[PDB]
Scaffold this active site. Structure first.
Site, PDB file in Angstrom:
ATOM      1  N   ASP A   6       0.781  -1.237   0.393  1.00  0.00           N
ATOM      2  CA  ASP A   6       0.421  -0.074  -0.488  1.00  0.00           C
ATOM      3  C   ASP A   6       0.744   1.334   0.044  1.00  0.00           C
ATOM      4  OD1 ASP A   6      -2.776   1.199   0.373  1.00  0.00           O
ATOM      5  OD2 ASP A   6      -0.962   2.204   2.230  1.00  0.00           O
ATOM      6  N   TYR A  23       2.656   9.783   0.471  1.00  0.00           N
ATOM      7  CA  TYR A  23       4.067   9.403   1.447  1.00  0.00           C
ATOM      8  C   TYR A  23       5.727  10.025   1.524  1.00  0.00           C
ATOM      9  CZ  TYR A  23      -0.715   6.759   2.969  1.00  0.00           C
ATOM     10  OH  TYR A  23      -1.541   6.056   3.270  1.00  0.00           O
ATOM     11  N   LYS A  73      -2.635   6.040  -4.449  1.00  0.00           N
ATOM     12  CA  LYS A  73      -3.796   6.950  -3.989  1.00  0.00           C
ATOM     13  C   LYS A  73      -3.075   8.337  -4.531  1.00  0.00           C
ATOM     14  CE  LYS A  73      -3.940   4.218   0.066  1.00  0.00           C
ATOM     15  NZ  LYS A  73      -2.347   4.558   0.782  1.00  0.00           N
ATOM     16  N   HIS A 116      -7.356   9.261  -2.866  1.00  0.00           N
ATOM     17  CA  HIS A 116      -7.101   9.582  -1.179  1.00  0.00           C
ATOM     18  C   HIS A 116      -7.969   9.235   0.206  1.00  0.00           C
ATOM     19  CE1 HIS A 116      -3.085   9.194   0.724  1.00  0.00           C
ATOM     20  NE2 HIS A 116      -4.047   8.759   1.546  1.00  0.00           N
TER      21      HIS A 116
HETATM   22  N1  LIG Z   1      -5.911   5.795   3.446  1.00  0.00           N
HETATM   23  C1  LIG Z   1      -5.718   6.357   4.548  1.00  0.00           C
HETATM   24  O1  LIG Z   1      -6.137   7.758   4.288  1.00  0.00           O
HETATM   25  C2  LIG Z   1      -4.382   5.866   5.006  1.00  0.00           C
HETATM   26  C3  LIG Z   1      -4.207   6.344   6.764  1.00  0.00           C
HETATM   27  C4  LIG Z   1      -3.342   5.678   7.896  1.00  0.00           C
HETATM   28  C5  LIG Z   1      -3.153   5.160   6.476  1.00  0.00           C
HETATM   29  N2  LIG Z   1      -3.125   4.537   5.525  1.00  0.00           N
HETATM   30  C6  LIG Z   1      -2.041   2.645   5.171  1.00  0.00           C
HETATM   31  O2  LIG Z   1      -2.072   2.359   6.057  1.00  0.00           O
HETATM   32  C7  LIG Z   1      -1.092   1.480   6.666  1.00  0.00           C
HETATM   33  C8  LIG Z   1      -1.206   1.656   8.325  1.00  0.00           C
HETATM   34  O3  LIG Z   1      -1.891   2.048   9.407  1.00  0.00           O
HETATM   35  P1  LIG Z   1      -0.212   2.944   9.983  1.00  0.00           P
HETATM   36  O4  LIG Z   1       1.325   3.438   8.766  1.00  0.00           O
HETATM   37  O5  LIG Z   1      -0.996   4.080  10.311  1.00  0.00           O
HETATM   38  O6  LIG Z   1      -0.197   2.357  11.269  1.00  0.00           O
HETATM   39  P2  LIG Z   1      -0.387   0.650  11.893  1.00  0.00           P
HETATM   40  O7  LIG Z   1       0.829  -0.258  10.847  1.00  0.00           O
HETATM   41  O8  LIG Z   1      -0.852   0.676  12.609  1.00  0.00           O
HETATM   42  O9  LIG Z   1       0.792   0.792  12.702  1.00  0.00           O
HETATM   43  C9  LIG Z   1       2.112   1.216  12.628  1.00  0.00           C
HETATM   44  C10 LIG Z   1       2.920   1.369  14.022  1.00  0.00           C
HETATM   45  O10 LIG Z   1       2.941  -0.671  14.380  1.00  0.00           O
HETATM   46  C11 LIG Z   1       4.005  -0.663  14.722  1.00  0.00           C
HETATM   47  N3  LIG Z   1       4.205  -1.894  14.579  1.00  0.00           N
HETATM   48  C12 LIG Z   1       4.382  -2.794  13.135  1.00  0.00           C
HETATM   49  N4  LIG Z   1       4.140  -4.144  13.496  1.00  0.00           N
HETATM   50  C13 LIG Z   1       3.976  -4.011  14.980  1.00  0.00           C
HETATM   51  C14 LIG Z   1       4.871  -5.729  15.948  1.00  0.00           C
HETATM   52  N5  LIG Z   1       4.574  -6.599  15.027  1.00  0.00           N
HETATM   53  N6  LIG Z   1       4.545  -5.281  17.371  1.00  0.00           N
HETATM   54  C15 LIG Z   1       5.110  -3.893  17.932  1.00  0.00           C
HETATM   55  N7  LIG Z   1       4.617  -2.548  16.269  1.00  0.00           N
HETATM   56  C16 LIG Z   1       4.450  -2.847  15.478  1.00  0.00           C
HETATM   57  C17 LIG Z   1       5.138  -0.158  13.849  1.00  0.00           C
HETATM   58  O11 LIG Z   1       6.462   0.509  14.132  1.00  0.00           O
HETATM   59  P3  LIG Z   1       8.045  -0.200  12.868  1.00  0.00           P
HETATM   60  O12 LIG Z   1       7.657   0.240  11.837  1.00  0.00           O
HETATM   61  O13 LIG Z   1       9.344   0.722  13.804  1.00  0.00           O
HETATM   62  O14 LIG Z   1       8.249  -1.642  12.846  1.00  0.00           O
HETATM   63  C18 LIG Z   1       4.517   1.257  13.311  1.00  0.00           C
HETATM   64  O15 LIG Z   1       4.874   2.350  14.650  1.00  0.00           O
HETATM   65  C19 LIG Z   1      -0.295   2.718   6.344  1.00  0.00           C
HETATM   66  O16 LIG Z   1       1.168   2.179   6.479  1.00  0.00           O
HETATM   67  C20 LIG Z   1      -0.657   3.233   5.139  1.00  0.00           C
HETATM   68  O17 LIG Z   1      -0.687   2.239   3.691  1.00  0.00           O
HETATM   69  C21 LIG Z   1      -3.804   5.216   4.591  1.00  0.00           C
HETATM   70  O1  LIG Z   2      -3.953  10.223   4.667  1.00  0.00           O
HETATM   71  C1  LIG Z   2      -3.343   9.078   4.974  1.00  0.00           C
HETATM   72  O2  LIG Z   2      -2.706   8.416   4.015  1.00  0.00           O
HETATM   73  C2  LIG Z   2      -2.677   9.383   6.377  1.00  0.00           C
HETATM   74  O3  LIG Z   2      -2.365  10.404   7.419  1.00  0.00           O
HETATM   75  C3  LIG Z   2      -1.640  11.615   6.820  1.00  0.00           C
HETATM   76  C4  LIG Z   2      -0.529  11.421   6.381  1.00  0.00           C
HETATM   77  C5  LIG Z   2       0.175  12.045   5.157  1.00  0.00           C
HETATM   78 CL1  LIG Z   2       1.890  11.936   4.140  1.00  0.00          CL
HETATM   79  C6  LIG Z   2      -0.299  13.419   5.345  1.00  0.00           C
HETATM   80  C7  LIG Z   2      -1.246  14.041   5.610  1.00  0.00           C
HETATM   81  C8  LIG Z   2      -1.858  13.084   6.350  1.00  0.00           C
HETATM   82  C9  LIG Z   2      -3.462  13.499   7.140  1.00  0.00           C
HETATM   83  O4  LIG Z   2      -3.077  14.459   8.126  1.00  0.00           O
HETATM   84  N1  LIG Z   2      -4.586  12.867   7.170  1.00  0.00           N
HETATM   85  C10 LIG Z   2      -5.307  13.270   7.671  1.00  0.00           C
HETATM   86  C11 LIG Z   2      -6.717  13.680   6.569  1.00  0.00           C
HETATM   87  C12 LIG Z   2      -5.515  14.606   5.091  1.00  0.00           C
HETATM   88  C13 LIG Z   2      -6.999  14.735   4.054  1.00  0.00           C
HETATM   89  C14 LIG Z   2      -8.433  14.786   4.511  1.00  0.00           C
HETATM   90 BR1  LIG Z   2     -10.135  15.741   3.813  1.00  0.00          BR
HETATM   91  C15 LIG Z   2      -8.154  15.053   5.943  1.00  0.00           C
HETATM   92  C16 LIG Z   2      -7.653  14.226   6.914  1.00  0.00           C
HETATM   93  F1  LIG Z   2      -7.822  13.799   8.465  1.00  0.00           F
END
Ligand SMILES: NC(=O)c1ccc[n+]([C@@H]2O[C@H](COP(=O)([O-])OP(=O)(O)OC[C@H]3O[C@@H](n4cnc5c(N)ncnc54)[C@H](OP(=O)(O)O)[C@@H]3O)[C@@H](O)[C@H]2O)c1
Ligand SMILES: O=C(O)COc1cc(Cl)ccc1C(=O)NCc1ccc(Br)cc1F
Ligand SMILES: [Br-]
Length: 310
Positions: A42, A47, A76, A109
């Site tokens: 993803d 990012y 995205k 996104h």
């Molecule tokens: N569509 C959107 O708006 C949106 C928004 C937020 C996220 N996302 C996507 O979703 C992905 C996942 O969400 P997220 O990055 O917010 O957080 P997450 O996956 O819920 O948590 C990431 C954190 O968990 C830690 N971690 C991972 N595996 C672990 C394990 N086995 N034990 C202990 N800690 C662990 C990682 O540490 P380390 O990396 O230091 O190992 C990092 O600090 C994002 O990276 C992005 O690709 C999309």
């Molecule tokens: O949006 C993501 O994937 C994760 O969150 C972020 C990642 C980056 Cl690199 C920068 C900023 C954010 C971040 O702030 N995301 C939150 C967000 C964004 C836009 C809108 Br309309 C609403 C909203 F809540």
């Protein structure tokens, strides 16, 4: 394993997240992920690390560790590119950085469009985001074109609420339905209403932040911590698994895709070891019971945008 999308393609239910993965660590993270079995990554332009993700993908394709057909790469469209004449170039920039000639899935996104320009969050002098007047429906038509031009195999949405999903599904002349809605989902934000709506329409839901995003930059020491919740630890202990493994298995058993992020090689590997155990129905319902409507991904500067989803 994989879930069938409404475009006829199969999507791996476990992927590697890359938000906050430092550019000097993410190339190794993605190489390790592919070496230990991940086939879904993803990504997003916002990012700021797609070049470095792409170096890993390309090296594994070159080395013939995996075939392109076996990978499922998601990215995205950022909010400053919702404009008809900017969508294709945004997609092409992502393709170039990822060293790909197509994406498996490309998502809007966020439902809000922002003023185009260099800044990812253009602000007015009082700190409010500056909107774009482009509607989610014209942005969707632009996404549909990318399918028809062969740049992407599937299109979808992210952070769309019920009404916003419905707006797309009701779009006059809709050509491709969204294949996926990617939304925050974990035991403190269980999303039962939005998931049942999406699943009822044949849209696959991807759970982001499944571990609670403990590295999100706006975290506070007092905030709830899924990884440290003793109740979840207890379920993990019963199954001889880690808390993270339980948090990743949970959405899988709800027929969701899940995308935990790590740059730590040992955790990347541990997080993939979730296909050899089963949470019981009682475990599932108990985890669902921890809902507190606690949302880690939200942003005050965008709360007055007409399309802010929450
Ligand atoms: N569509 C959107 O708006 C949106 C928004 C937020 C996220 N996302 C996507 O979703 C992905 C996942 O969400 P997220 O990055 O917010 O957080 P997450 O996956 O819920 O948590 C990431 C954190 O968990 C830690 N971690 C991972 N595996 C672990 C394990 N086995 N034990 C202990 N800690 C662990 C990682 O540490 P380390 O990396 O230091 O190992 C990092 O600090 C994002 O990276 C992005 O690709 C999309
Ligand atoms: O949006 C993501 O994937 C994760 O969150 C972020 C990642 C980056 Cl690199 C920068 C900023 C954010 C971040 O702030 N995301 C939150 C967000 C964004 C836009 C809108 Br309309 C609403 C909203 F809540
Ligand atoms: Br938004």
């Amino acid at each position: 394993s994989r879930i069938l999308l409404n475009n006829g393609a199969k999507m791996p239910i476990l992927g590697l997240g890359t938000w906050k993965s430092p550019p000097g660590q993410v190339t190794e993270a993605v190489k390790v992920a592919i070496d230990v079995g991940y086939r879904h990554i993803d990504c997003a332009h916002v990012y700021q690390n797609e070049n470095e993700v792409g170096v890993a993908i390309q090296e594994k394709l070159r080395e013939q560790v995996v075939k392109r057909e076996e990978l499922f790469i998601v990215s995205k469209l950022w909010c400053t590119y919702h404009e008809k004449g900017l969508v294709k170039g945004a997609c092409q920039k992502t393709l170039s950085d990822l060293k790909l000639d197509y994406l498996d899935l490309y998502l809007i996104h966020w439902p809000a469009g922002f003023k185009p320009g260099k800044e990812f969050f253009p602000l007015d002098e009082s700190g409010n985001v500056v909107p774009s007047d482009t509607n989610i429906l014209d942005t969707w038509a632009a996404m549909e074109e990318l399918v028809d031009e062969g740049l992407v195999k599937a299109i979808g949405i992210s952070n769309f609420n019920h009404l916003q999903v419905e707006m797309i599904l009701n779009k006059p002349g809709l050509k491709y339905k969204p294949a996926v809605n990617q939304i925050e989902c974990h035991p403190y934000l269980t999303q039962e209403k939005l998931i049942q709506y999406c699943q009822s329409k044949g849209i696959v839901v991807t759970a982001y932040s499944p571990l609670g995003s403990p590295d999100r930059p706006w975290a506070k020491p007092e905030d709830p911590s899924l990884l440290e919740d003793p109740r979840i630890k207890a379920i993990a202990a019963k199954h001889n698994k880690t808390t993270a493994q339980v948090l990743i298995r949970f959405p899988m058993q709800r027929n969701l895709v899940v995308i935990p992020k790590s740059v730590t090689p040992e955790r990347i590997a541990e997080n993939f070891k979730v296909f050899d155990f089963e949470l019981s129905s009682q475990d599932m319902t108990t985890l669902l019971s921890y809902n507190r409507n606690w949302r880690v991904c939200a942003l005050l500067s965008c709360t007055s945008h007409k399309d802010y989803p929450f």
